[PDB]
Amino acid sequence: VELTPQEAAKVATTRCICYSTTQYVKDFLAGPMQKVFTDTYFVEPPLDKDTAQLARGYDVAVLFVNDRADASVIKELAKAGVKLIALRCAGFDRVDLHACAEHGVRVVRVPTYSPESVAEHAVALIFALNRHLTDAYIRVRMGNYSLSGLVGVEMRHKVVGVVGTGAIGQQAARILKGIGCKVFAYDIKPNPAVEAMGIPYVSLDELLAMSDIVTLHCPLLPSTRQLINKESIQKMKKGVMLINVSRGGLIDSAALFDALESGQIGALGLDVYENEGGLFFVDHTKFDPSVRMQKWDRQFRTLLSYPQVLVTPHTAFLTEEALNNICTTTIQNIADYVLDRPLGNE
Amino acid sequence: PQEAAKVATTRCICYSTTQYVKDFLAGPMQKVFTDTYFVEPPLDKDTAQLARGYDVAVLFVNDRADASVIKELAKAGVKLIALRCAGFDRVDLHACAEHGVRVVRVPTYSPESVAEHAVALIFALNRHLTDAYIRVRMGNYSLSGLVGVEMRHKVVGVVGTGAIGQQAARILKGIGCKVFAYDIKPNPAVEAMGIPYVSLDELLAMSDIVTLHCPLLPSTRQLINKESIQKMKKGVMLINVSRGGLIDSAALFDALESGQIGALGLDVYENEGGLFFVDHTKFDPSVRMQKWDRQFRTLLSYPQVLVTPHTAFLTEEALNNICTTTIQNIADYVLDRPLGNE
Amino acid sequence: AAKVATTRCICYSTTQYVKDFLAGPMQKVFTDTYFVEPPLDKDTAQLARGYDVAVLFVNDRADASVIKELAKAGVKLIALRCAGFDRVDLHACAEHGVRVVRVPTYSPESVAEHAVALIFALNRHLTDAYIRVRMGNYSLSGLVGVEMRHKVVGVVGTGAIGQQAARILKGIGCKVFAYDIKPNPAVEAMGIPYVSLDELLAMSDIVTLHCPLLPSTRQLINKESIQKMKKGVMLINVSRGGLIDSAALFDALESGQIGALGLDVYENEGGLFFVDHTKFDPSVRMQKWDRQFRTLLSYPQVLVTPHTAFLTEEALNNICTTTIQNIADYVLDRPLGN
Amino acid sequence: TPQEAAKVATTRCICYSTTQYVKDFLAGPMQKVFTDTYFVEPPLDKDTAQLARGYDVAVLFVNDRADASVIKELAKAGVKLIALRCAGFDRVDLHACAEHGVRVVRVPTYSPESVAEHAVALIFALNRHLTDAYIRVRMGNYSLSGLVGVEMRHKVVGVVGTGAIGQQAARILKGIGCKVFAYDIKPNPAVEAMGIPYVSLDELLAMSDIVTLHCPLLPSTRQLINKESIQKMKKGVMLINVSRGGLIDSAALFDALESGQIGALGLDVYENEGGLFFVDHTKFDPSVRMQKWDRQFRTLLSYPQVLVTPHTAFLTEEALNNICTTTIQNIADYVLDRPLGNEVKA
Ligand SMILES: NC(=O)c1ccc[n+]([C@@H]2O[C@H](COP(=O)([O-])OP(=O)(O)OC[C@H]3O[C@@H](n4cnc5c(N)ncnc54)[C@H](O)[C@@H]3O)[C@@H](O)[C@H]2O)c1
Ligand SMILES: NC(=O)c1ccc[n+]([C@@H]2O[C@H](COP(=O)([O-])OP(=O)(O)OC[C@H]3O[C@@H](n4cnc5c(N)ncnc54)[C@H](O)[C@@H]3O)[C@@H](O)[C@H]2O)c1
Ligand SMILES: NC(=O)c1ccc[n+]([C@@H]2O[C@H](COP(=O)([O-])OP(=O)(O)OC[C@H]3O[C@@H](n4cnc5c(N)ncnc54)[C@H](O)[C@@H]3O)[C@@H](O)[C@H]2O)c1
Ligand SMILES: NC(=O)c1ccc[n+]([C@@H]2O[C@H](COP(=O)([O-])OP(=O)(O)OC[C@H]3O[C@@H](n4cnc5c(N)ncnc54)[C@H](O)[C@@H]3O)[C@@H](O)[C@H]2O)c1
């Protein structure tokens, strides 16, 4: 269940190439990998058809959500010699699995980030929004120390709907219960851990009607898609703070502006937005504005305009503790592959 | 009783009425008092004659009084000062004593507000919410150096366990932290949560996060200094939502740069006189240079520093308490009831 | 000569800068001068009770209701620290015996140099650079700028300010062209050609609007004329928001048809400009929220200043001294002209 | 040049520090001339020099390392030519290149208009408080205080140094309508023909509303601006420096800023730029940022009347074109065995 011991010499002969190695990937990943693998190539640019020829000679490609593997790039990784792709994340969506089947490449993945990391990020948003912390930081940096219109709100007895009670939502429910909020939950299947905290399960319509704060933790499924829309928003409680760290597909962004301007939605925290492909995990600040105009998302940039909206760039999973897990699971995954163990993260 | 008809005839003026003071306060006051004068500018000698017919002056922290303004406020006729805050410190009770002017005030903010704000600072710093917000607004959606930290199993020292420290201890335990406390007197609501009381030195040595809730006393002045900081745990997040006097600000720069203090949240800074509760951006820079605080401005420069402008008390709920305590304060004064607030 | 000194003046909308430039010179003349921080409406007009002259600004509105309360308050004169009388009615003033005076021109170098400052800031991405550097991003991408030296610049409108804009731009080294119904001989003596608007729109790298707002000029820049411009054009409007049809800006920004935009003015400034909306709760800000304006501020190649083109030591001085002379002339029964 | 183009095309070129702007201005032109061109995003090290294996010419920038040790590894990689996409050779070791057979070529001049227009840019922005204005408008503060600006038309402007760049600064500023005065050890006949008088340094400092530094950094010009000379200036003076950080003693700035002696400061440059400029430090954890933290620079950025750009005065479409075409011509001449002339050597 641990060490190698010297089967590690075999693991060490594995040659790993890692795409999209940005500063944080260097910080958490590069160090642990070179302790195990003798040869590891860290490529800063993402993975495409032009940087896939970079992988010639390597056995395994380490990838992230922003890296592309569709049918064209899988063919040149297979011809490069890499027979395993390991994701440092749990998203496999952007990889083509039908292409991997033809080319013999096996893909392994990290199914779980540490659930406290994500749950605590949702809670961070609530606190920031309640206390208008981003507003105040900026004003104070400019040298505006006046109090208007920074007046905030107490969380202590507020009613909190937790939508979806899986691993992360459970953590959200625990934390929000501990802050002292009155917590309610909705899920298709009740979580006994949540019930044992004394948080009642109610129907979704009831949860939307009674909540000061609603936090989305459910997965994105056809049944959950645009859970928040023009209709369900009119069912919520006027002034509601809506938090989403799960999936952008859970919210229909078009409906948000009217709801915000009517005061129907009083506040919005988001770690996610419905179309993030090409948008997130990119610093667009580095491109000339004429080039930024090519992929420009106007309704997103408009959304960012509101003082009661707060958006982070998909950092809810991004934590020392979560990265450590991602790293050790990616490495255990490399080893299981090379040592012929059953993978299970495939 | 219809003593409210006696109460209603009370004439009230409030200084330093900014937008937020209008919102929470003016509405509730005119429900009670028939004649109510709201002055946007603060309290001085030149705006004390604005108080010439009124019975009671409602005041704030950044306002005065001097020993002397009690007199033309007195000759204005106001024998009562009603504070919308808990500081009477900046007014002298010795000048008011001579002029028959009585001092009343709101001694308590709802302590969850203050405690929850300290928790807000901790969360914001852990997750780089201010860095993240600004980048996202510019169109930088990249991840480096937004990497945060989990709070769940971290060790948190609460320094001072009075009303606000109690809520802070309570909240941080509910979140899952390992909470320790220091105070002269253990708070039994805190001991009943199974939070151990340890020595200040032990608490500084073990804490990942230290949050100061003690009052400013000679014993606690510059509690945090060059010496005590070296007693702490490398990388510590220090939070001060109480009094600027608890920290020796000069000592922060070396400690931030060595990594000894890993992050700092502040709702208070030691010299707030003339600094806080003013929007300095409305002044030409040459006028700003006159009161410029160089070490405060340097301090804002660090990415791991987060400073709010004394907003920890500032909440719907807390403003409500203040309002209703202030209105009860006016009423008790008028009806010759005992004040209890002074 | 000591008769003028006896004048009693109230000034509405006194913010900090109004204090700095104005109150000092005024109290050198008039013995009693009342400065009210809040603007002019119905309710703060009774503050003018007894005063003979009220000095006002653009954010102050005087319709029939606020005019009646000052009139019975006693003020027979309104003096503007600005050139707009638009928000006041002159027909109500006719009925209540109150006369309208104003400062009709700011120092045109101030206004023109501001248009030039906008061009320079956008060319060199100064706002981007400032903020990044404040954050500690000292990297070079995507701060790459543009030279102004040989660029083609259209000046639309040749009056006192456009003249200065033309002069400055020629001195910078640009190839300057102009459109106006009346050629300005000062502009022609600089060897700047007057051409038709279509020709100017087709050839300009930088187009800067200096014409007044007239029925002929309204939405001068619109969906159709924009397609007549040169792809990548930098558009500057320091005159009037009505000269531009704002709705049309977004597709054109996004198509690259307009490459950059500076604005000191926007078509709907009513209730919007000269207010710091950040002192309000967001639930209150949502009431006057201008979504297309907030969207517009979103673009990296857009730069908007809050109607500061006139706001200058020199221009504030002119405004002050013309205001003091307007008051004096009224009191002395001289012909106004303002 | 047809056959010479095929011979030039056979050149193998590697470029270090290829960030977005280098891809934009450089890569396109290079791939039209050289058949094989390698663009590496990280800067040059001892470790990234091993990337140059097989390559003929390394294209480098001011931020790239050639100290005595990396020249050793580039030599053995096979590169005989180093082309700087810049005019600074300060960081390359020419004593090491001499020993290892490596020749260094360079771009000695950017368009002097680009730089001169940048200083003028700073002047306008500060005069009109454009950075303050932009930020407030973005937050939704549309109020006028303390944004009040100043007219440039009749102001007295000292230009210090009248070379290619100072000459342009003088031309532009006279054109704006300023009364321009100049100082140089040697008068520039083009400046005199603009009708701009030459005065002593003390005379210019005493009379100027605006001082703009364009002289090179010399033992005579070292800390030209210091505690003493600053008290000779005119109270409220705006100081602009786009030339060299060494011209100003940064310690002296704070007292003068706070006393009002220096009324405003625009800078494209600062005294120790090494490891500081051309890096985005926001990509690092704050704890790593604390290692090189420059307390006095960060403090300087705190002032409302100070404006700092990150060495962008040369950074222009037009200037980069000069740089690209001169660099490609530098390569071609080398390949075609022509006399170089942009060669720096020891
Ligand atoms: N850092 C980030 O922003 C990031 C990255 C990747 C994933 N995520 C999010 O984390 C989520 C996983 O959270 P988890 O750990 O708690 O997973 P989980 O499996 O443990 O919990 C999911 C729960 O949702 C419930 N559910 C199923 N259908 C539903 C419906 N129609 N309505 C409501 N609830 C329903 C399930 O019963 C289950 O209890 C992902 O789905 C994704 O949303 C976030
Ligand atoms: N919005 C703001 O930022 C704001 C405004 C006003 C006041 N405050 C701060 O909040 C404080 C009040 O908090 P509170 O309501 O809980 O008051 P409190 O009286 O209930 O708590 C004070 C506790 O500190 C203890 N104490 C006394 N001497 C001590 C020592 N040497 N060391 C350690 N502990 C000691 C006391 O026994 C007491 O239990 C104020 O003193 C002020 O510092 C903040
Ligand atoms: N600080 C500010 O931002 C601010 C404040 C108030 C007014 N303004 C603007 O400044 C302007 C005043 O500038 P000015 O001193 O140069 O005015 P001006 O009267 O002296 O010149 C206006 C010129 O526009 C010309 N013109 C008339 N119809 C035209 C048309 N259809 N097309 C093109 N040109 C036409 C006129 O012939 C005239 O020569 C105001 O009209 C206003 O737009 C700016
Ligand atoms: N993007 C940037 O910010 C950037 C990049 C590279 C270089 N630069 C600057 O541009 C400079 C080159 O400018 P240039 O093209 O005009 O070269 P230049 O030779 O034509 O200008 C320098 C002038 O200063 C004069 N001079 C010499 N000693 C002097 C003294 N003691 N005092 C005053 N003046 C003196 C020289 O005679 C010369 O005329 C570089 O030295 C550098 O400072 C800026």
Numbering used by the authors:
A (entry chain D): 22 to 367
B (entry chain C): 26 to 367
C (entry chain B): 29 to 366
D (entry chain A): 25 to 370
Task: Give the original sentences from the paper that presented this experimental model.
Of these, the most likely d-nLDH is Cre07.g324550, which shows 30–33% protein sequence identity to known d-nLDH sequences and possesses the NAD+-binding domain (GXGX2GX17D), and the conserved histidine (for catalysis), arginine (for substrate binding) and glutamic acid residues (for modulating pH dependence) characteristic of such enzymes. As expected from sequence comparisons, enzyme assays confirmed that the protein was a d-LDH with a preference for the reduction of pyruvate to d-lactate and a specificity for NADH. Consequently, we annotate Cre07.g324550 as Cr-LDH1. Our immunochemical analysis clearly showed that Cr-LDH1 was located in the chloroplast, consistent with the presence of a predicted chloroplast transit peptide.
